[PDB]
Design an enzyme around this catalytic site. Structure first.
Site, PDB file in Angstrom:
ATOM      1  N   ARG C  98       4.721   1.196   4.126  1.00 18.70           N
ATOM      2  CA  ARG C  98       3.767   0.651   3.156  1.00 18.70           C
ATOM      3  C   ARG C  98       2.563  -0.069   3.787  1.00 18.70           C
ATOM      4  O   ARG C  98       2.587  -0.417   4.969  1.00 18.70           O
ATOM      5  CB  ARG C  98       4.496  -0.258   2.144  1.00 18.70           C
ATOM      6  N   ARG C 105      -7.328   1.565   8.442  1.00 14.67           N
ATOM      7  CA  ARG C 105      -6.735   2.745   7.805  1.00 14.67           C
ATOM      8  C   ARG C 105      -6.123   3.681   8.870  1.00 14.67           C
ATOM      9  O   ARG C 105      -5.043   4.225   8.635  1.00 14.67           O
ATOM     10  CB  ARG C 105      -7.761   3.466   6.897  1.00 14.67           C
ATOM     11  N   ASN C 137       2.576   8.843   2.015  1.00 17.85           N
ATOM     12  CA  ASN C 137       1.144   8.526   2.060  1.00 17.85           C
ATOM     13  C   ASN C 137       0.627   8.105   3.435  1.00 17.85           C
ATOM     14  O   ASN C 137       1.373   7.436   4.152  1.00 17.85           O
ATOM     15  CB  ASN C 137       0.806   7.432   1.061  1.00 17.85           C
ATOM     16  N   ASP C 165      -1.710  12.376  -9.979  1.00 21.17           N
ATOM     17  CA  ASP C 165      -3.023  12.027 -10.527  1.00 21.17           C
ATOM     18  C   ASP C 165      -3.279  12.842 -11.810  1.00 21.17           C
ATOM     19  O   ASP C 165      -3.687  12.271 -12.821  1.00 21.17           O
ATOM     20  CB  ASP C 165      -4.147  12.326  -9.516  1.00 21.17           C
ATOM     21  N   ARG C 168      -0.825  11.771 -14.696  1.00 25.54           N
ATOM     22  CA  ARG C 168      -1.293  10.499 -15.259  1.00 25.54           C
ATOM     23  C   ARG C 168      -2.504  10.717 -16.166  1.00 25.54           C
ATOM     24  O   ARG C 168      -2.562  10.164 -17.266  1.00 25.54           O
ATOM     25  CB  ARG C 168      -1.660   9.509 -14.139  1.00 25.54           C
ATOM     26  N   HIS C 192      -5.934  12.784  -2.850  1.00 29.62           N
ATOM     27  CA  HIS C 192      -5.026  12.007  -3.693  1.00 29.62           C
ATOM     28  C   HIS C 192      -5.296  10.510  -3.568  1.00 29.62           C
ATOM     29  O   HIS C 192      -5.397   9.978  -2.457  1.00 29.62           O
ATOM     30  CB  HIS C 192      -3.555  12.307  -3.348  1.00 29.62           C
ATOM     31  N   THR C 247       6.355   2.698  -7.382  1.00 24.07           N
ATOM     32  CA  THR C 247       6.335   3.755  -8.402  1.00 24.07           C
ATOM     33  C   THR C 247       7.466   4.730  -8.069  1.00 24.07           C
ATOM     34  O   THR C 247       7.652   5.077  -6.895  1.00 24.07           O
ATOM     35  CB  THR C 247       4.946   4.421  -8.540  1.00 24.07           C
TER      36      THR C 247
HETATM   37  N1  LIG Z   1       2.247  11.326  -3.081  1.00 22.98           N
HETATM   38  C1  LIG Z   1       2.251  10.455  -4.143  1.00 22.98           C
HETATM   39  O1  LIG Z   1       1.657  10.654  -5.190  1.00 22.98           O
HETATM   40  C2  LIG Z   1       3.060   9.235  -3.961  1.00 22.98           C
HETATM   41  C3  LIG Z   1       3.399   8.461  -5.054  1.00 22.98           C
HETATM   42  C4  LIG Z   1       4.165   7.330  -4.841  1.00 22.98           C
HETATM   43  C5  LIG Z   1       4.574   6.990  -3.562  1.00 22.98           C
HETATM   44  N2  LIG Z   1       4.213   7.753  -2.526  1.00 22.98           N
HETATM   45  C6  LIG Z   1       4.602   7.457  -1.153  1.00 22.98           C
HETATM   46  O2  LIG Z   1       5.968   7.776  -0.912  1.00 22.98           O
HETATM   47  C7  LIG Z   1       6.405   6.974   0.198  1.00 22.98           C
HETATM   48  C8  LIG Z   1       7.774   6.368  -0.066  1.00 22.98           C
HETATM   49  O3  LIG Z   1       7.658   5.320  -1.019  1.00 22.98           O
HETATM   50  P1  LIG Z   1       8.940   4.388  -1.399  1.00 22.98           P
HETATM   51  O4  LIG Z   1       8.497   3.416  -2.454  1.00 22.98           O
HETATM   52  O5  LIG Z   1      10.180   5.226  -1.625  1.00 22.98           O
HETATM   53  O6  LIG Z   1       9.125   3.592  -0.011  1.00 22.98           O
HETATM   54  P2  LIG Z   1      10.437   2.795   0.482  1.00 22.98           P
HETATM   55  O7  LIG Z   1       9.981   1.934   1.641  1.00 22.98           O
HETATM   56  O8  LIG Z   1      11.161   2.285  -0.747  1.00 22.98           O
HETATM   57  O9  LIG Z   1      11.304   4.054   1.039  1.00 22.98           O
HETATM   58  C9  LIG Z   1      10.956   4.623   2.294  1.00 22.98           C
HETATM   59  C10 LIG Z   1      12.233   5.139   2.919  1.00 22.98           C
HETATM   60  O10 LIG Z   1      11.927   5.933   4.071  1.00 22.98           O
HETATM   61  C11 LIG Z   1      12.913   5.608   5.029  1.00 22.98           C
HETATM   62  N3  LIG Z   1      12.505   5.937   6.381  1.00 22.98           N
HETATM   63  C12 LIG Z   1      11.710   5.201   7.216  1.00 22.98           C
HETATM   64  N4  LIG Z   1      11.619   5.775   8.398  1.00 22.98           N
HETATM   65  C13 LIG Z   1      12.391   6.906   8.321  1.00 22.98           C
HETATM   66  C14 LIG Z   1      12.676   7.898   9.247  1.00 22.98           C
HETATM   67  N5  LIG Z   1      12.149   7.862  10.539  1.00 22.98           N
HETATM   68  N6  LIG Z   1      13.469   8.910   8.861  1.00 22.98           N
HETATM   69  C15 LIG Z   1      13.948   8.904   7.609  1.00 22.98           C
HETATM   70  N7  LIG Z   1      13.748   8.006   6.640  1.00 22.98           N
HETATM   71  C16 LIG Z   1      12.955   7.022   7.071  1.00 22.98           C
HETATM   72  C17 LIG Z   1      13.154   4.134   4.844  1.00 22.98           C
HETATM   73  O11 LIG Z   1      14.396   3.778   5.434  1.00 22.98           O
HETATM   74  C18 LIG Z   1      13.124   3.991   3.348  1.00 22.98           C
HETATM   75  O12 LIG Z   1      14.403   4.231   2.771  1.00 22.98           O
HETATM   76  C19 LIG Z   1       5.342   5.932   0.475  1.00 22.98           C
HETATM   77  O13 LIG Z   1       4.638   6.405   1.618  1.00 22.98           O
HETATM   78  C20 LIG Z   1       4.463   6.001  -0.756  1.00 22.98           C
HETATM   79  O14 LIG Z   1       3.121   5.671  -0.463  1.00 22.98           O
HETATM   80  C21 LIG Z   1       3.481   8.856  -2.700  1.00 22.98           C
HETATM   81  O1  LIG Z   2       1.039   5.105  -7.864  1.00 21.74           O
HETATM   82  C1  LIG Z   2       1.008   5.084  -6.645  1.00 21.74           C
HETATM   83  O2  LIG Z   2       1.620   4.104  -5.914  1.00 21.74           O
HETATM   84  C2  LIG Z   2       1.239   3.842  -4.560  1.00 21.74           C
HETATM   85  C3  LIG Z   2       2.262   2.954  -3.973  1.00 21.74           C
HETATM   86  C4  LIG Z   2       3.657   3.223  -4.057  1.00 21.74           C
HETATM   87  C5  LIG Z   2       4.450   2.276  -3.457  1.00 21.74           C
HETATM   88  S1  LIG Z   2       3.499   1.030  -2.765  1.00 21.74           S
HETATM   89  C6  LIG Z   2       2.046   1.776  -3.290  1.00 21.74           C
HETATM   90  C7  LIG Z   2      -0.115   3.182  -4.445  1.00 21.74           C
HETATM   91  C8  LIG Z   2      -0.668   2.441  -5.470  1.00 21.74           C
HETATM   92  C9  LIG Z   2      -1.925   1.899  -5.276  1.00 21.74           C
HETATM   93  C10 LIG Z   2      -2.584   2.109  -4.079  1.00 21.74           C
HETATM   94  C11 LIG Z   2      -1.967   2.856  -3.098  1.00 21.74           C
HETATM   95  N1  LIG Z   2      -2.655   3.064  -1.887  1.00 21.74           N
HETATM   96  C12 LIG Z   2      -2.091   3.526  -0.670  1.00 21.74           C
HETATM   97  C13 LIG Z   2      -0.728   3.516  -0.423  1.00 21.74           C
HETATM   98  C14 LIG Z   2      -0.203   3.980   0.764  1.00 21.74           C
HETATM   99  C15 LIG Z   2      -1.065   4.474   1.719  1.00 21.74           C
HETATM  100  F1  LIG Z   2      -0.561   4.915   2.889  1.00 21.74           F
HETATM  101  C16 LIG Z   2      -2.430   4.497   1.497  1.00 21.74           C
HETATM  102  C17 LIG Z   2      -2.939   4.014   0.306  1.00 21.74           C
HETATM  103  N2  LIG Z   2      -0.758   3.388  -3.286  1.00 21.74           N
HETATM  104  C18 LIG Z   2       1.240   5.132  -3.781  1.00 21.74           C
HETATM  105  C19 LIG Z   2       0.470   6.140  -4.538  1.00 21.74           C
HETATM  106  O3  LIG Z   2      -0.135   7.080  -3.752  1.00 21.74           O
HETATM  107  C20 LIG Z   2       0.331   6.131  -5.867  1.00 21.74           C
HETATM  108  S2  LIG Z   2      -0.511   7.317  -6.775  1.00 21.74           S
HETATM  109  C21 LIG Z   2      -2.160   6.683  -6.856  1.00 21.74           C
HETATM  110  C22 LIG Z   2      -2.586   5.634  -6.062  1.00 21.74           C
HETATM  111  C23 LIG Z   2      -3.879   5.167  -6.172  1.00 21.74           C
HETATM  112  C24 LIG Z   2      -4.760   5.749  -7.060  1.00 21.74           C
HETATM  113  C25 LIG Z   2      -4.342   6.807  -7.843  1.00 21.74           C
HETATM  114  C26 LIG Z   2      -3.044   7.273  -7.744  1.00 21.74           C
HETATM  115 CL1  LIG Z   2      -2.524   8.595  -8.751  1.00 21.74          CL
END
Ligand SMILES: NC(=O)c1ccc[n+]([C@@H]2O[C@H](COP(=O)([O-])OP(=O)(O)OC[C@H]3O[C@@H](n4cnc5c(N)ncnc54)[C@H](O)[C@@H]3O)[C@@H](O)[C@H]2O)c1
Ligand SMILES: O=C1O[C@](c2ccsc2)(c2cccc(Nc3ccc(F)cc3)n2)CC(O)=C1Sc1ccccc1Cl
Ligand SMILES: NC(=O)c1ccc[n+]([C@@H]2O[C@H](COP(=O)([O-])OP(=O)(O)OC[C@H]3O[C@@H](n4cnc5c(N)ncnc54)[C@H](O)[C@@H]3O)[C@@H](O)[C@H]2O)c1
Ligand SMILES: NC(=O)c1ccc[n+]([C@@H]2O[C@H](COP(=O)([O-])OP(=O)(O)OC[C@H]3O[C@@H](n4cnc5c(N)ncnc54)[C@H](O)[C@@H]3O)[C@@H](O)[C@H]2O)c1
Ligand SMILES: NC(=O)c1ccc[n+]([C@@H]2O[C@H](COP(=O)([O-])OP(=O)(O)OC[C@H]3O[C@@H](n4cnc5c(N)ncnc54)[C@H](O)[C@@H]3O)[C@@H](O)[C@H]2O)c1
Ligand SMILES: O=C1O[C@](c2ccsc2)(c2cccc(Nc3ccc(F)cc3)n2)CC(O)=C1Sc1ccccc1Cl
Ligand SMILES: O=C1O[C@](c2ccsc2)(c2cccc(Nc3ccc(F)cc3)n2)CC(O)=C1Sc1ccccc1Cl
Ligand SMILES: O=C1O[C@](c2ccsc2)(c2cccc(Nc3ccc(F)cc3)n2)CC(O)=C1Sc1ccccc1Cl
Lengths: 324, 324, 331, 322
Positions: C98, C105, C137, C165, C168, C192, C247
């Site tokens: 996170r 960045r 991310n 996105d 939503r 994204h 989320t």
């Molecule tokens: N693409 C999207 O639209 C979107 C939306 C929401 C969240 N995300 C992303 O998804 C990711 C996960 O979010 P989260 O809330 O579940 O985070 P979290 O920290 O709750 O879960 C991350 C998990 O990854 C595990 N991990 C860390 N290093 C690891 C490794 N080397 N091998 C295997 N597992 C490992 C951790 O132990 C943890 O359980 C974040 O990067 C978040 O930004 C993306």
């Molecule tokens: O809803 C979300 O929650 C996260 C999240 C989940 C667990 S902690 C954050 C979040 C929310 C707010 C900002 C942000 N910036 C970020 C997160 C990780 C990076 F490495 C780089 C940038 N990230 C991750 C994510 O991508 C989305 S979607 C989304 C996000 C922004 C705009 C539109 C959309 Cl649709």
């Protein structure tokens, strides 16, 4: 004490009226296909079947009941008497000279519709029987129901067929191929070329000759092949069942679950596109618990609009000469 | 230059083999009911249909394809040639004349089965065609497949009908009414009274007269009604489709998803209940990706055991005089 | 003889390789939500879970296994070792680190790149023929990272991208019009997150273009302020984080929707991150969201969306920013 | 004229038919919510909690997934007016005699607020100690016993059938077995009913469920207890398994299936139990809640275990203030 009493202790016997009941009128090829599709989609807690042929009606009910183990519909009933249809949320009518062929199904409806409204005054009526556009009007006139509770299957099958053919030509799933066939169900249907798209990318914008006689690729043929495929199926197997049953089940799901999804269904088109007669034509409608709650105002070309007006005049010409 | 090329940019056009393909042989009332139930359950990524009547076959395929918008099966193919069935995971045989039934059907299987194994050497064969117990043996002998990949529908419909009737007497859903009808499919089936239960409570333990002629509650009528209902459905509508199609789809699900659920299906029973001949009878079988991987050794009474042995002798008497 | 042998007669004891196996890497909030969605949609005959936190991993696997009676997935496995993931058709990467206040960045990307350089070689080792679906991310950069380390062709490396996105956006669109999001069509493309691009020209209901009826749609001059529908997509993402801390449900459901098209070879169009080099004047190895046809081979085809010059400029700017980070990445 | 009015012509602008309420949006509550949403059981889902921020966040997260669901309306709020006319109310609010009374005080506010807006609902209690709190909900509501259902041994049975399935290499759907009485540590496995395809395991294996047994099949029930503590030690809570089991109960209620489930009900009048206690027995679940109950033939030992559990639960219940 019986085995039932020795095994089961009863808390209460107080039974309730069905909560999500569906009735299917006419247990032919269409009716049975609608029945199985509804049962497999788990839309009803009770399914009632009606027909005039008592033996085939009992047989079809029994065949469905024997499959209960694989279903989530605890009660399947049938009968010649409409008392079996009491408290239905949705009633699907699939029971079946051309003015006399209209009157053939009209006099059949003169009996069905009052019997349906008697036991389910608050139901939604879904008309499948042909000519669907005229018979939806007939059902509306005899029932006295407001426009929203009288729905015609209309161009739902035409659009589904169109999207399948569109999908095959582009190598994309029909769910991702958007296209609307509107107006009068069957031969005289209107494909709305301006709305034909994939991922919001308008096909007419990329290809201005889309659906025109001067188009090199002849995309107009996608609509021609809908009409021709309908005649082909009839020539090959004698009737159509699966495609219509699945489409009706899709309408039923929107109604039963109050989804508010848009579908091409036959509705009272009066006041739109220069139409003043009481006619039912297909337009995209928002479907839910009150039936047709809203309709989408599609932008039509002068040519498309003229075709809709001509269909309306033809339907009102037949309707004018009907006995009630 | 084409609209397809202007709209869609292709990354690759290598073709892969279907991953979860199902073939249905014989597109009659049973075959089509199996098809729709499999389609509505999303078990296959491809469905192939085979028959000898070309017209009916094309019509049925087209009717299913026109419903694609409401399904999750991207490909539906049909043909007289078995090349359309290539790489099927499961092949369902529902062909033949709807004993002379044996004669006609053996000769029909003499050509179907080698054509099936030619294009799908690794498939599971699920036999529905009657006499299901003899024809499962015939399919096994002609194919050369191991015991586990040749499955007969057997007493799956009998047990489903029994549980429905059991459910109606107790006011309980058939899913919660456990009961097994085993042995030879049809008239000579065996109800296993000792295993009849609700929530693990044995019915024969609470009511010792269960299944006997001295039972005032006449529970023996429940199994007789299974036999009677089968004749009644035939008299009333001319055939059975929905109940069998739904039961076959339930078997298909266990196979396709490798569930390892127990089902009453026809398997090679040589080595059990004093049977020494190559006969297929219904016993509870564990169904998964390899077909019948295991079977449940049901404890039977002397009476039930004698009925099974008699059925085995009768089936072998027909089988040993058949020509391959 | 045992009770098992007395009750059950075995025909054959040989087990086949799994036919429709899915692996989820990272069992955090997102991973677990992807797991439950895939299980409830019956998309796999086998589900494998991987993480670095052994206790949390075993607990999550056990909790899913205890619900087997209500599921149609006969086998749920977990482990730190990737041998549990062998022969997966689809591998979903949700492992990440996170945002930390007071870092560049590039630094944020590198920490997640460090996480991937162990995962990706271990994934391809046991599933050389899988499809990779990246959720972690910054999803667009990390899809590129996964593609570069794996050596897989472009079609087998898919980024979640603008799938959440768009979902939503369609929800918000549905709310304004009183219509179900399934009937409200709209595409959010490109990068994204914060810099996503709403494609106003494609926004429609029943094939009726909203921009055609209302030319000021998405313009700052708009009286009805429809531009704020896309701004609310961005705002809601920050609001959810402020309110619950993460989320999960929305992302898990969207990933399951992608998984369904891949597993069932549906050939449905989805807004996913793909190698966009050769389109919209983009000459760099960058992954951006465009509508893609998803099936058994992953991204087999893509839809060539007609963009206005400002939509194209926004895409090019995103590409330049992503490449700027990517060129400075060490792996 | 707005864009909405230019695009859509309204016929009429005229209440939920299959509404479900979940009270307490913690790990259990949210797992019940997603399972119900994915099973398409409700046309409306209402969420209630005391923590306003977490509540809004959870509602929003579910709403953003609407495109992939068939539940058109998701509402939340601190005020129970959001729960009006629910067919089923699922209570998952509470601590993961002294502590029991604190949970009674929580229920003294929830239960009157629930019956006020949904007088005809079915109450499904998940909160622990589930058997005592089911009684609490029944006493405060004034509802007939058929409309007050406790989750009870539903999770215990599901766990048992999973463990039974693993030992036999069979799917839990085909492995029948009933764990009855008091939910948790003091649950009773009914060995006589344990079967596959109607074949009694106790008949084939007489030592089944005794210490004497070389195959130690008694461990199938003891690993249910052990696994519960293990899950808690490993991840801190249990969510998926309980959420899936609740959706299974919700399905039989919502669709009026009349399936048999091991749920907590008023057991007074059975096995010589005189006190107002709720224990798990197999119940027929439908539109009226528990319409009927299966009278399981229990051994003297099993029967004594239920009676002892009843005496222990009554001992706590009598000293409660409400
Ligand atoms: N693409 C999207 O639209 C979107 C939306 C929401 C969240 N995300 C992303 O998804 C990711 C996960 O979010 P989260 O809330 O579940 O985070 P979290 O920290 O709750 O879960 C991350 C998990 O990854 C595990 N991990 C860390 N290093 C690891 C490794 N080397 N091998 C295997 N597992 C490992 C951790 O132990 C943890 O359980 C974040 O990067 C978040 O930004 C993306
Ligand atoms: O809803 C979300 O929650 C996260 C999240 C989940 C667990 S902690 C954050 C979040 C929310 C707010 C900002 C942000 N910036 C970020 C997160 C990780 C990076 F490495 C780089 C940038 N990230 C991750 C994510 O991508 C989305 S979607 C989304 C996000 C922004 C705009 C539109 C959309 Cl649709
Ligand atoms: N709307 C569409 O897109 C669409 C598509 C296909 C078919 N259809 C129409 O559906 C209708 C049914 O077709 P089918 O192939 O099932 O016909 P069919 O002859 O197989 O079935 C008609 C059934 O209606 C029954 N019936 C007749 N009079 C009745 C009455 N008074 N009350 C109750 N039942 C009565 C008959 O006994 C028969 O069972 C036809 O009118 C056909 O044109 C419409
Ligand atoms: N196992 C059970 O519990 C059960 C239940 C019901 C019916 N059945 C059996 O299923 C079978 C089919 O019944 P139906 O009502 O569909 O019969 P039907 O006559 O309606 O259909 C039989 C189909 O098989 C086709 N066929 C004939 N020869 C063929 C060949 N050489 N290759 C391919 N297809 C061929 C026919 O063209 C016809 O379409 C019957 O044998 C019936 O007894 C079994
Ligand atoms: N019956 C079973 O088999 C079973 C299984 C697992 C857990 N449980 C029980 O379920 C309960 C919930 O567990 P959890 O892990 O979700 O707990 P949690 O602490 O994660 O969630 C509890 C939620 O209830 C809320 N809450 C507290 N007071 C409230 C009130 N007055 N009104 C509304 N909401 C209120 C809290 O704000 C919190 O969100 C526990 O009592 C646990 O023992 C029962
Ligand atoms: O596929 C179909 O089969 C039928 C049918 C016939 C016997 S049994 C089912 C059919 C098939 C072919 C022609 C025809 N002419 C007709 C339709 C409505 C009337 F009032 C009178 C005559 N009717 C009924 C039906 O409406 C359709 S759809 C459809 C039909 C035509 C074009 C496009 C589409 Cl989409
Ligand atoms: O309901 C059914 O329909 C058929 C059918 C379908 C289309 S024409 C007949 C039928 C119905 C009635 C009798 C009969 N006699 C028969 C069964 C198997 C043979 F090999 C030869 C003859 N066959 C076929 C079938 O097997 C069943 S099941 C069933 C059948 C009998 C008793 C119990 C059950 Cl459960
Ligand atoms: O697996 C579970 O997790 C919990 C839990 C959830 C979040 S923190 C703990 C748990 C686990 C261990 C002990 C315990 N103490 C407790 C349980 C019920 C009471 F009445 C009073 C106290 N509670 C709650 C719960 O009931 C179950 S089920 C279960 C529990 C024990 C044996 C068999 C089964 Cl089946």
């Amino acid at each position: 004490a019986t085995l039932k009493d020795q095994l089961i202790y009863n808390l209460l016997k107080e039974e309730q009226t069905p909560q999500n009941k569906i009735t299917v009128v006419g247990v032919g090829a269409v009716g049975m296909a609608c029945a199985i599709s509804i049962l497999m989609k788990d839309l009803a807690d009770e399914l009632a079947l009606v027909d005039v042929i008592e033996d085939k009606l009992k047989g079809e009910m029994m065949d469905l009941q024997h499959g209960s183990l694989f279903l989530r519909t605890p009660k399947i009933v049938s009968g010649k008497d409409y008392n079996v249809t009491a408290n239905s949320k949705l009633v699907i009518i699939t029971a079946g000279s051309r003015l006399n062929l209209v009157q053939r199904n009209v006099n059949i409806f003169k009996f069905i519709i009052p019997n349906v409204v008697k036991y389910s005054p608050n139901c939604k009526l879904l008309i499948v029987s042909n000519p669907v556009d005229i018979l939806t009007y007939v059902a509306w006139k005899i029932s006295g129901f407001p426009k929203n509770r009288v729905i015609g299957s209309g161009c739902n099958l035409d659009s589904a067929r169109f999207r399948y053919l569109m999908g095959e030509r582009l190598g994309v799933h029909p769910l991702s191929c958007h296209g609307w066939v509107l107006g009068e169900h069957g031969d005289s249907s209107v494909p709305v070329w301006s709305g034909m798209n994939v991922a919001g990318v308008s096909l007419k914008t990329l290809h201005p000759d889309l659906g025109t006689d001067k188009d090199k690729e002849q995309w107009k043929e996608v609509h021609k092949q809908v009409v021709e495929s309908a005649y082909e199926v009839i020539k090959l197997k004698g009737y159509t069942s699966w495609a219509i049953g699945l489409s009706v089940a899709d309408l039923a799901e929107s109604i039963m679950k109050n989804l508010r999804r848009v579908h091409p269904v036959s509705t009272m088109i009066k006041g739109l596109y220069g139409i003043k007669d009481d006619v039912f034509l297909s337009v995209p409608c928002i479907l839910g618990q009150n039936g047709i709650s809203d309709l989408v105002k599609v932008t039509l070309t002068s040519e498309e609009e003229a075709r809709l007006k001509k269909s309306a005049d033809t339907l009102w010409g037949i309707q004018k000469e009907l006995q009630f």
